[PDB]
Amino acid sequence: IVEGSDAEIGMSPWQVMLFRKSPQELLCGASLISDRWVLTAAHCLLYPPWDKNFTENDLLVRIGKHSRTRYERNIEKISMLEKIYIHPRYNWRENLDRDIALMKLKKPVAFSDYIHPVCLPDRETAASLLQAGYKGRVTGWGNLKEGQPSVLQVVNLPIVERPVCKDSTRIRITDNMFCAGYKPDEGKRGDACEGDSGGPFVMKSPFNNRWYQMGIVSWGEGCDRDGKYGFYTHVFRLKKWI
């Protein structure tokens, strides 16, 4: 992640890697919203314009994930999908709207100190927080600058005034997409970059001091420019579909 710091053992038992078999590689990131379910970015799985499309077959998934390279032996978990679920009003054509998808693990993952779920909002929770200025941590082993960490990368970002988020871009945004990251003036940087994608936007609830997945890494044209913020997915509006 642009302008970030290295993660800690246990600090996000909810992160999984989107690692195809061959070119045996890492394509994205995901979250454990179950004992046997996983959700993530949409494009991250079906992007025509840059010919892509996968299947359970294609890829295999991985958990317990501190090191980005290694073989997390007896602390790392892994299984391959049993079926992918894209979301029917997806706009890879338009702006990468309802950038979401879920993957029913062919097999169930039993938890531990490294693999532990996340919960999803309620208009309530999704209301206290989802507010200008209130920050969120976004993780992943993406692109250190606009080369790749050896370990996990954690940033913190404040929401942004819905308007200001509009004239950051030039792409037409929907009440479904939410934009994070500090300002030009603010004097401080951060951003989740290449491969940060499909990553969680976990926010902490002061009420029940629970960890609440507020978003999903969708886009941004860049990697920490004095003038734009990244854009993520409303884990919520879409809380219906999920």
């Binding site: 494009h43 992007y47 702006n95 290449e194 941004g220 044209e221």
Partner: peptide, 11 residues
């Protein structure tokens, strides 16, 4: 959209 911009693949 994803990677990227400022409709070309990676890099």
């Amino acid at each position: 959209x994803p990677r990227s911009x400022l409709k070309y693949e990676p890099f």
